[PDB]
Amino acid sequence: GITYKGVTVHTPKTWHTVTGKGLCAVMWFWILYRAKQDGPVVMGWRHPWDG
Amino acid sequence: RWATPGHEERPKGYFMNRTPPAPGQSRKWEDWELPCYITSFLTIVILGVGLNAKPDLSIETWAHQKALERLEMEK
Amino acid sequence: GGGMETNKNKFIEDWGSARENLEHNFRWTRRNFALIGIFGIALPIIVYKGIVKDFHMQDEDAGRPHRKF
Amino acid sequence: FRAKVWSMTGGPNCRPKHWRRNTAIAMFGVFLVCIPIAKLSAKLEQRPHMPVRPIPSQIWCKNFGTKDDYEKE
Amino acid sequence: YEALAWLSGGLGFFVGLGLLAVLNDKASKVPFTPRVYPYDNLRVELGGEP
Amino acid sequence: GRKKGLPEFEESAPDGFDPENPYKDPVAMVEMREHIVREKWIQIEKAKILREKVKWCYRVEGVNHYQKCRHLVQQYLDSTRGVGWGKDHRPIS
Amino acid sequence: MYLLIVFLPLLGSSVAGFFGRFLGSEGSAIMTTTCVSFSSILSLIAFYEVALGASACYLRIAPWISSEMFDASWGFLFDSLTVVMLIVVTFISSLVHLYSISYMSEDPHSPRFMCYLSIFTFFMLMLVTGDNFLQLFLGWEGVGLASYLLIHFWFTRLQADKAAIKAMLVNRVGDFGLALGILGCFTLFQTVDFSTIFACASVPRNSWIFCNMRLNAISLICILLFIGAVGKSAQIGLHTWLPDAMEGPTPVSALIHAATMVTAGVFMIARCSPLFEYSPTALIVITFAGAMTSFLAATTGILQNDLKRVIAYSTCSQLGYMIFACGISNYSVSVFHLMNHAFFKALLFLSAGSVIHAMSDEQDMRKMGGLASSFPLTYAMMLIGSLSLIGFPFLTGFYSKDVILELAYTKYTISGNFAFWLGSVSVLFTSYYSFRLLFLTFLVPTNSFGRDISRCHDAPIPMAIPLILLALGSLFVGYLAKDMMIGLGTNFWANSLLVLPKNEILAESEFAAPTIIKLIPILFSTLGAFVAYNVNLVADQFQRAFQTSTFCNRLYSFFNKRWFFDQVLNDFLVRSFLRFGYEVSFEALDKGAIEILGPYGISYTFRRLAERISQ
Amino acid sequence: YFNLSGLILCPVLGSIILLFIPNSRIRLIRLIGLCASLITFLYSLVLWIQFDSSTAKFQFVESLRWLPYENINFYLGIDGISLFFVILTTFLIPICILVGWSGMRSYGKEYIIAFLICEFLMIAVFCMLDLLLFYVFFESVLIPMFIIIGVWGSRQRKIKAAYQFFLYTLLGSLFMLLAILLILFQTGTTDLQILLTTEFSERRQIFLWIAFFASFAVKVPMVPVHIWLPEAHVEAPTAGSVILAGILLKFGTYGFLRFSIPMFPEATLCFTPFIYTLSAIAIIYTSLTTLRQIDLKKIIAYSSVAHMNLVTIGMFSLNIQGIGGSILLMLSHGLVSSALFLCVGVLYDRHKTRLVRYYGGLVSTMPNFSTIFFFFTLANMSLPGTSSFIGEFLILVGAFQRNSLVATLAALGMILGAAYSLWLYNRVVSGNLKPDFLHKFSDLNGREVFIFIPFLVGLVWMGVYPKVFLDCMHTSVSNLVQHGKFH
Ligand SMILES: CCCCCCCCCCCCCCCCCC(=O)O[C@@H](COC(=O)CCCCCCCCCCCCCCC)COP(=O)(O)OCC[N+](C)(C)C
Ligand SMILES: CCCCCCCCCCCCCCCCCCCC(=O)O[C@H](COC(=O)CCCCCCCCCCCCCC)COP(=O)(O)OCCN
């Protein structure tokens, strides 16, 4: 990271940003994945398993 | 730092604070050490091959065999 | 700096060998009477009565008459 | 003054030169004494239940499916 | 000593809100009936006598 | 100077002891006292063996242990009424 | 093989402690952690061969106390309930061991740390695998001993010393009840083992003769056991220790404060399941205490401005929730929330330590501002952990909190409704201070100093793999374990957990849901999100600082000083004890009062009587 | 044929040889004294091999006439209880020789004379079936302890310390002697086997029980009389002070087992609540007194007082497990208290302060001493896995089975035991280091390191596997509990 008048911040390493992004995107996708397949379970409408 | 050799020629401190003598000679055992050491060895051997040689006669195993042959008599 | 023993500070010596002998202080005062009569004659009597009452209640449940003790 | 005291569990920054050599011995030492623990336990671990599926512990064990009855303990 | 005054109120809210759960009587507000099992409420498998 | 087997002191009864006058034959009173403990340890040990009976029963049967060990549970609960010196209900020995 | 699960951590600890000079600060780090990881692999194998291949494993080493009909043995109970906690303890212990080697690379006394950690691992393995009360009691006391040793890792640190001492005393006063419980249950069964009392634990129906009056027998035993669990679960009775326990190192706190010793008190109830269900009186007071503790902690954590202090109150709130779960005979959600908690709070603890030691060792909310973009990895980790903590819908934490709140609502007992109300109102508090933590840090202008920002260094790789593993876990484990273990009569528990026919309300906790109460805690969560964002990001001109006249500063002090418990309890119990141990026992009992028979009591008496006898 | 006679003769030969050895030959005096002590220890150990833990009657007995009509005579023997006490007495004394080994030049040969005299003296106490001669050797230990406290006391105030320890003992001793005279005049003899088989009068039972309790309540520190132990115990040499809490403290408590419980079956039952109400409040009052203490020696003595008051509860609670647990606790306490006084005396032999204020931060130095002190504090801390916990768990079990109230008060003792011992440990060897007072100091050398090795191994052995100790004496405890009654 570029240096300023006191904040000479160091940029995060290569694997400390892309790994975080590509691991958090998994959870973001998984939220909707469980909200689509097992989503209809707990909403009060269209109770699954033969309902 | 997992590949560099340690910066220590010898573990720091002296065992029982006894400074090792010049190389070549023994430790010069002290007067109390020899009788105490041989008595410790004798204690170890007596409690080892004496305790595991005493027959198991007590009020527990005798009662165990007696109740094993007495509970079976229910008829 | 070759003394293995402690320096034996003056202000600590009195603190040490003053609490060792408190007979002179604890002879006759008003609070001492209350403390002794509330924690050396009162509490032992209460706990003894509790223990004998527990023994009596244990006896009653089994039905056997309570021993005089 | 840290070098004077023995510090049996190791000094603050105790870094022996041949620490890898000692660690190899220490790890080997654990393994060689771990075998008697495993070997002596083979005469133990009584589990009368029979699992619905085979486990990999049948080779060193035989105390399963044998202690069925409880009238001759 | 002023802390004990706040101590009484702090625990008083807990017990006070505990008593309020008695004033509504949710036990009688069950929307269903007590559960029943076969064989005298599973008497053989819960004790009793065979 | 003993045989390698387990000792056997005596089992039937001490004849000298008379309950009407407990302190009448001092020689035979100690025999009665030791016989009491040597016979009570038998009951303690059979209680232990029936305890292991029950424990292995619970360790084998599974979820149906409320209907396949009651014949041993009643053999344990009554065996604790007069076992050893543990509770103020001393056995009438 | 099953002995290797328990004895290997002890062997590693012993060899590391005895030969910590032969092995460097890294030799012990790579040796003890390797041994603990081997133990974890063994635990995973046992879980595969027991949890799925349902056949519990039993053993007995040697008789410990071979007195008359008091058979104490070194046997273990490798049961279906036990092996789940084997997984929980071993996985987290190995991950913490990997976590600490990066943290302790600068701390001088490194090998002693892994020695203590392995001692703790061995003790709690002995506890969880145990099958006798007294043989479980050694693990119960050893957990406290290791807790004291680890919080006392800094002998120079004065605060750590006092915290450790007070923790030992309060834990002793706590497990006093359990210690009484071992011999309380012994006087009715004349045995101490588990398999011989769970077979016939409902038969006794008599009373006792206690100190004051005759009460019930089984109920009193269960009450004593719960009081014992209070000390090791920071309940309403004695929770003075956990808030002050984070005075030691961080990597241990991820293992002792929020992961495993958390599980001791709840696992007390969980193991002895067919004892509390036959004591309905104890269950009700257990529910009261659990709900009260959960609410107290949830409202406690909000004011505090430290990383470790606030999350300790979150841990105590989860303790209260789990104690309630164990108080309504619904032990399923108790262990499910235990397994979830050991993931999503250990992860948060590792994240907090990573952001603390990488920022010049500062743990504060008032001073440290925002540096989220400086490093996204551990913030993504902690965000996932927080999302689990609030229990966002269709996450790991949701599948536990939702079902436990529904179970709280369903039971219509006088304790079920009250505690459900308390849990519902505590969800708002927990979702408030969790997002307060998410906002006061990493989402505000940086209020820190200009030197610490320059000295910035992200989380090293070896300490990030445990975080990766925990993040992988607490996103799929909830979905994987929702069906298999809380699934309306799953056949893997067998005798591990027994639920009485009468108090079995599970099917109508899902098929009788009004749908206006099941999805309400998400509503309190989003309301807490809104209010926290408004107060801590935009509307802080008056909503933050309240410089009123009276009743508002004292409101700040009441919750900052946690209900003055550390004040009233100290002054009225321990200060009085210390005062009267010198001015009562040492004044009017032995020294001064009856000392009128020793020196200066009779010595001067014979300096007058003997004198006037020669003349 | 390793009988009991040689076990008493060997220390006598050791003392006799030492009498005629010149003071200059300091090399030989210590060597021969230590050799005699170790031979006595081995001769005691070999008895455990041939113990034959099966019979209710007594083991090897030696009868030597003492009166013209063989009315009363020296009648030796052990049954199941005094055996372990004999072993521990024979084991503690060589530790006493070893701890006072470096400074023997100033002590002279008179130091070993007193210790060996007391050695065979306490040997002759535990294995002494005759009741009167049990009192002769029971109070014979006055002279050696008097001499040890006075001649080689640490500070000058030792004069007043010994007077209490003496006179308090004499008062109860003669009160017991009167009861012994009443029993002998009534019965006719004092042999234990016969005297246990005599029908007593209930009115006579209470008076004789009180008369025995007059002294036996002084040996074990009770509420009315416990002042002597701290004052006369902080002011004794470490080698000598380690057996005031080692064997000199187990006479009265063990004297209850052999001469009170089976002797007066109908009086102990009638006086059971009194012992409960004494000991339960003792464990509280003494423990509270312990907290506000500054001297390093006095705290350990007070903890010992609390432990003895705890074991007294489990002893008078007549249970097959209560008495066994009492014996286990007494052996464990004899180990741990001895170890603790050596641990706090090695500090005194280097710095000579006996104040916790000066001590501090002794973990940054002498870490081995810190580890040993922590282990022995944990043993005194009453943790499971050590021999103590086996000791008091059985006490609690025996007390609760009889009375529910007494068990809670007794367990308050092990709750409060974490208040003073842990505080001392953290205030002595885990504080902030101060160079103002402790300018320089060494660590344990090969002597005190080897001294604690038998203590540690015995502690762990009797803590993790107490089976052999319980195995060897289940018959004797069963015989003792079942006495007088027949149901
Ligand atoms: C419930 C009781 C169970 C049995 C008790 C043993 C359990 C462990 C108890 C001891 C734990 C370690 C506590 C030692 C004292 C801690 C303070 C201390 O003195 O530290 C010493 C000692 O260090 C140690 O911790 C040594 C630990 C040895 C204990 C290892 C054995 C533990 C496992 C045994 C358990 C029994 C196994 C079962 C037996 C059948 C030195 O540490 P340093 O890192 O060198 O720092 C000192 C500063 N300076 C360098 C400047 C000098
Ligand atoms: C630092 C170096 C120290 C060296 C010491 C050894 C190094 C290891 C130290 C670790 C601690 C180990 C301590 C021993 C633990 C043994 C636990 C099991 C013992 C046990 O109960 O079994 C007994 C074994 O006999 C035996 O053979 C036991 C022998 C033990 C010898 C110990 C000697 C200590 C002497 C101390 C005297 C103190 C006196 C105090 C009163 C007999 O059991 P069983 O009856 O079932 O027989 C079976 C017949 N079927």
Check the CA dihedral H365-H371-H377-H383 and report its sign: positive
Q: Is the CB of H370 under 6 A from ligand 1?
A: yes
Unique residue bearing structure tokens 């980790």: G381
Pairing of strands H63-65, H73-75: antiparallel
Identify which of H297, H302, H422, H439 has the alpha carbon closest to the alpha carbon of residue H354.
H297
How many other C-beta atoms can be found within 10 angstroms of the C-beta atom of residue D60?
12
Please tell me the total number of residues recorded for chain D in this structure.
73
Q: Would you call G21 an interface residue with chain B, using a CB distance cutoff of 8 Å?
A: yes
Inter-axis angle of helices G377-390 and G331-344, to 10 degrees? Answer: 160
DSSP H or E segment with residue H212: helix H202-219
Question: Contacts of residue G589 in chain C, CB cutoff 8 Å?
Answer: 36, 39-40
Method: cryo-EM
Pairing of strands G76-78, G72-73: unpaired
Separation of alpha carbons H160 and F68, rounded Å: 73
DSSP H276-330: HHHHHHHHHHHHHHHHS--BHHHHHHHHHHHHHHHHHHHHHS--HHHHHHHHHHH
Separation of alpha carbons H231 and H224, rounded Å: 15
Q: Would you call G556 an interface residue with chain E, using a CB distance cutoff of 8 Å?
A: no
Identify which of G62, G71, G50, G66 has the alpha carbon closest to the alpha carbon of residue G196.
G71
Sequence-ordered list of residues with C-beta below 8 angstroms from that of G345, at least 6 positions apart, any chain: G258, G259, G311, G314, G315, G318, G385, G389
Unique residue bearing structure tokens 């009389």: H225
Q: Would you call F62 an interface residue with chain E, using a CB distance cutoff of 8 Å?
A: no
**CB-closest option in G152, G156, G585 to H289:** G585
For chain B positions 15-74, those within 8 Å of chain F (CB to CB) are: 55, 57, 59-68, 70-71
Unique residue bearing structure tokens 């002697």: H177
Residue G72, strand partner residues:
G65
**CB-closest option in D3, D10, D15 to B7:** D15
Q: How far is CA G51 from CA G42, G243, G492, in A?
A: 14, 36, 6
Separation of alpha carbons G30 and D19, rounded Å: 11
Reduced to 3 DSSP states, what percent helix, strand and coil does chain C have, rounded to the nearest 5? 60, 0, 40
Unique residue bearing structure tokens 């000295």: G455
DSSP H or E segment with residue G65: strand G63-65
Reduced to 3 DSSP states, what percent helix, strand and coil does chain H have, rounded to the nearest 5? 70, 0, 30
Separation of alpha carbons F17 and F29, rounded Å: 6
Which protein residue's CA is at the shortest distance from atom 8 of ligand 2? H457
Separation of alpha carbons G398 and G340, rounded Å: 10
**CB-closest option in H277, H357, H404 to C44:** H277
How many other C-beta atoms can be found within 10 angstroms of the C-beta atom of residue D62?
11
Separation of alpha carbons H108 and H23, rounded Å: 7
Mutation pick from C51, C52, C53, C67 vs chain H, by most beta carbons of H within 10 Å, is C51
Ligand 2 neighbours (beta carbon < 6 A): B 43-44, 47-48, 51-52, 56; H 87-88, 91, 331, 453-454, 457-458, 460-461, 464-465, 467-468, 471
Q: Would you call B56 an interface residue with chain G, using a CB distance cutoff of 8 Å?
A: no
Ligand 1: centre distance to CA G147 (Å): 14
Chains touching chain A, criterion 3+ CB pairs below 8 Å? G
| Alpha helices (H) along D1-73 | 19-41
- Residue H177's identity, in one-letter code, is L
Mutation pick from G33, G48, G58 vs chain D, by most beta carbons of D within 10 Å, is G58
- Residue H110's identity, in one-letter code, is E
- Residue E23's identity, in one-letter code, is L
Contact H446 B30 (CB under 8 A): yes
For chain F positions 15-44, those within 8 Å of chain B (CB to CB) are: 37-38, 41-44
Identify which of H97, H90, H201, H220 has the alpha carbon closest to the alpha carbon of residue H148.
H97
| Residue B73 exposure: Cα atoms within 13 Å on the Cβ side | 5
Q: Looking at ligand 2, which atom is closest to the CA of residue H465? A: 21
Ligand 1: centre distance to CA H89 (Å): 30
Q: For residue H56, what are its two tokens?
A: 């209710």
Identify which of H250, H256, H270, H139 has the alpha carbon closest to the alpha carbon of residue H207.
H270
DSSP H or E segment with residue G400: helix G398-410
Euclidean distance between the first and the last CA atom of chain G, given in angstroms as a whole number = 91
Whether G396 contacts G482, CB under 8 Å? no
Contact G375 A35 (CB under 8 A): no
Whether G51 contacts G492, CB under 8 Å? yes
Separation of alpha carbons G83 and G341, rounded Å: 17
Whether H34 contacts H104, CB under 8 Å? no
Whether H454 contacts H88, CB under 8 Å? no
Q: Would you call G63 an interface residue with chain B, using a CB distance cutoff of 8 Å?
A: no
Q: Looking at ligand 2, which atom is closest to the CA of residue B51? A: 25
Q: Is the CB of H426 under 6 A from ligand 1?
A: no
Unique residue bearing structure tokens 């069964």: G189
- For a mutational test of ligand 2's pocket, the pick from B39, B47, B54, i.e. the residue with the most ligand atoms closer than 8 A to its C-beta, is B47
Separation of alpha carbons G416 and G408, rounded Å: 5
Measured between CA atoms, the residue of chain G closest to residue A44 is: G515
Separation of alpha carbons G525 and G90, rounded Å: 33
Whether G177 contacts G230, CB under 8 Å? yes
Q: Is the CB of G11 under 6 A from ligand 1?
A: no
* Strand ranges, E, within G66-158: 72-73, 76-78
Measured between CA atoms, the residue of chain F closest to residue G493 is: F63
Inter-axis angle of helices G377-390 and G414-440, to 10 degrees? Answer: 160
- Ligand positioned closest to the Cα atom of B53: 2
DSSP G312-348: HHHHHHHHHHHHHHTTTT-HHHHHHHHHHHHHHTHHH
Residue H65, strand partner residues:
H73
Separation of alpha carbons G178 and G235, rounded Å: 14
**CB-closest option in D26, D45, D53 to G31:** D26
Separation of alpha carbons H303 and H308, rounded Å: 9
Measured between CA atoms, the residue of chain F closest to residue C60 is: F88
- Min Cα distance H401 → chain F (Å) is 6
Q: φ, ψ for residue H381 (rounded to 5)? A: -70, -10
Unique residue bearing structure tokens 């205490």: G289
Sequence-ordered list of residues with C-beta below 8 angstroms from that of F74, at least 6 positions apart, any chain: none
**CB-closest option in A16, A30, A42 to G458:** A16
Q: For residue B31, what are its two tokens?
A: 């007067």
Separation of alpha carbons G348 and G315, rounded Å: 11
Separation of alpha carbons H35 and G91, rounded Å: 55
Separation of alpha carbons G195 and G71, rounded Å: 13
The CA radius of gyration of chain G, in Å to the nearest whole number, is 26
Inter-axis angle of helices G398-410 and G461-485, to 10 degrees? Answer: 40
- Ligand positioned closest to the Cα atom of G6: 1
Separation of alpha carbons H247 and D69, rounded Å: 52
